[PDB]
Design a protein around this nucleic acid. Sequence first.
RNA 1: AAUGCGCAGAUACCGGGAGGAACGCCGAUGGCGAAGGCAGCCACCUGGUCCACCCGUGACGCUGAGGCGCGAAAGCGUGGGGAGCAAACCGGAUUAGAUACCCGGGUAGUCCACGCCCUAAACGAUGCGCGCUAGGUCUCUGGGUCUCCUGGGGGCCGAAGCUAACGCG
Lengths: 273, 101, 73, 88, 119
Amino acid sequence: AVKKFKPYTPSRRFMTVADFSEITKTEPEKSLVKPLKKTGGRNNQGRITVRFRGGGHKRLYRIIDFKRWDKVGIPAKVAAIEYDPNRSARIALLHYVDGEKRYIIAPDGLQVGQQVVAGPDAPIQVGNALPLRFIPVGTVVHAVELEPKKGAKLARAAGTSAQIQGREGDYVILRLPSGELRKVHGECYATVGAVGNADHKNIVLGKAGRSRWLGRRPHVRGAAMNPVDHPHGGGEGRAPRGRPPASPWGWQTKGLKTRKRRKPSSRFIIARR
Amino acid sequence: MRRYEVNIVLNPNLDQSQLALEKEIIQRALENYGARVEKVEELGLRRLAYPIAKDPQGYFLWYQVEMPEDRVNDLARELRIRDNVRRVMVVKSQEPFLANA
Amino acid sequence: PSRKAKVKATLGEFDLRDYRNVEVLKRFLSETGKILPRRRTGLSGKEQRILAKTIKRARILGLLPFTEKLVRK
Amino acid sequence: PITKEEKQKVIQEFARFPGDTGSTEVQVALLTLRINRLSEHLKVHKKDHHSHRGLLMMVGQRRRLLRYLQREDPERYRALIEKLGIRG
Amino acid sequence: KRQVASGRAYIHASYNNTIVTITDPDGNPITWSSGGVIGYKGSRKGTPYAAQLAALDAAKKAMAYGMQSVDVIVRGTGAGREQAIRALQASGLQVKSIVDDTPVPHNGCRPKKKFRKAS
RNA sequence: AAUGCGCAGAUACCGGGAGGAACGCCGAUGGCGAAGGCAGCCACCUGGUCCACCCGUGACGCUGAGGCGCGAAAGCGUGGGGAGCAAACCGGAUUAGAUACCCGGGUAGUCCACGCCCUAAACGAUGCGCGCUAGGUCUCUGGGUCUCCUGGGGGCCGAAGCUAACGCG
Ligand SMILES: [Mg+2]
């Protein structure tokens, strides 16, 4: 449902922007708790570590909660759905029936009024959060914790979904959004339903200024430099790639694997990628 | 309305307690969608030809559900989920035919 | 079409739309499971189409193998 | 489908005397009630082109009767427009 | 090992070879024979003569182990299906009835151009 | 016959598992649609169509220059899937040469949503609606008083008559 423009300037015949009909009767901000004020900074205590960042608008952070075991057996209500500039998914607000209000990354198709609940004995429809040894085989699951009591970590961004392959013994097998197969402990919480906001990959930024609005300085190439800094460069003329592709610090950048082969977590992957 | 009926083939490991509760689930959810049993018959543990889930036998059902047309296609989802119900299908009913007298 | 058994006049009052009585339509998948052509029975078209239709109904819910084997070959 | 009771109420809704099974005014109304219900589910589906031509086969039937109805009395013709609610 | 006298025997040709397998009646095979065991190259392999030769090479092992009660299933047609059934009684071996296999694909996989010559 | 494949265990042999596309006998000189065309089973939502009684209206009819909709397969834009098959292409063989016919591999595409292309041996090589002119034989579907009289759809032989002839009838 992406809205697209007419060419009344040289930089608006390609610009598109998503539609915002999902955002409901909301958009003031929550009270003395949740948000907080957050820090912008391109570098550590000292010098630059990640190149080419810094700039753009002003931005606050809303405390959305991933560990969901802390209130079991208590039903809740979906109040409103608003829009969060840190991550790429739409977030929703939950009232509990005893007075706590918390934000949640919203799955595919929740509406205002509908009930959501967690716990080891909750029914299976879109929204409910359950430990993994109870969920049937072949569903679509998001916000999957890895090994228990450590917060939701996997498959939680903008229209992606893990998939239960099959139980065996104490561990269950997930197919991941990259594509590989991992063994995960049974006592990890999860949440049934795809994430939604699927259309995010189909907007075209149009001009050179609404890249800068997001926080990204312009990105110099490597052949347009001297030899004192990048390995490419020099070349009176326009040089042909010079003896094979390289990174500014020495290592190579076509085909080389950097996973530590000694790592303890190689017992759990079959790696299907 | 119409003259519906249903065949349900069930798990043959069904003796005194799960039999009663997974007949009352069928009966009361039938009434929750709104349906009127008249010709309940269920016909025991009987045989099958080809190995439906490794078992050469299974239990059987028959009702004469009077259902409104609005939810006949989507009342199947109390039966999609429970694996222990094996086969589920729902047909109309008639008989104007008797030949070779 | 030669007649060696002629199963039409052999059995009397029957029912085609019924798919509970497997004792009638056990003879009508004769050996392998193949539904039989009209040269065997002699039934006309509006009976033979629903004779095929009831075997295709009852062929789902067990009671009929529809795939299996003959051993004299 | 279309049950017994709406077809059996529109006939004496648009009858002149209470006896007739159908006449020049009420067969227009039967075609109008079939149009008003067939036209809706095309918005749901938009790919039953056979039902599309079935729609067109009777629009050009009821309009070809409305052509004749004017050829006797035009105030009698103006009865049915405001009575059915067709073609503003 | 010199086990129980019951056994199964699954035979097949395709068009231009023939093999015979001998199997324990609730499990694993014992001794398979083929046409490359005999010593034939190209044609002379899928011939109606090399059926009984393989079915008589496959008796020196079923006799040397404890096997005296056969079943036989046949898989398809070729050059050699007609003669191994006669070759069983060359060793005797208490033969039983003759078993169908060879499924119809039931409108399954598309065949090659060689079988779409028949449109 | 070779190129390929296998002794780090292949082919065939058994029981579970993932995964697409296609639906065996029924089936034919069979039916349905305005034409292209359509076959596993289940329900939902819908157009068209023939017969029986013969109930009411009352000529409302037939054909259509331009307008609008439908339109196999290959092909093209935007995202999903990929087992088999498979244009381009690299091999093996054949041959005087073989950019081909035969064998082993092999992507786009064939598949699913949404927007466009609009061609044919789109063929009964037969515009459409109605009225008159001997009959045989089989088959499909209704009303029946069902050795058959009747109202329609699908084939094969034949009166008169037609055509340059073959032939339709
Ligand atoms: Mg270098």
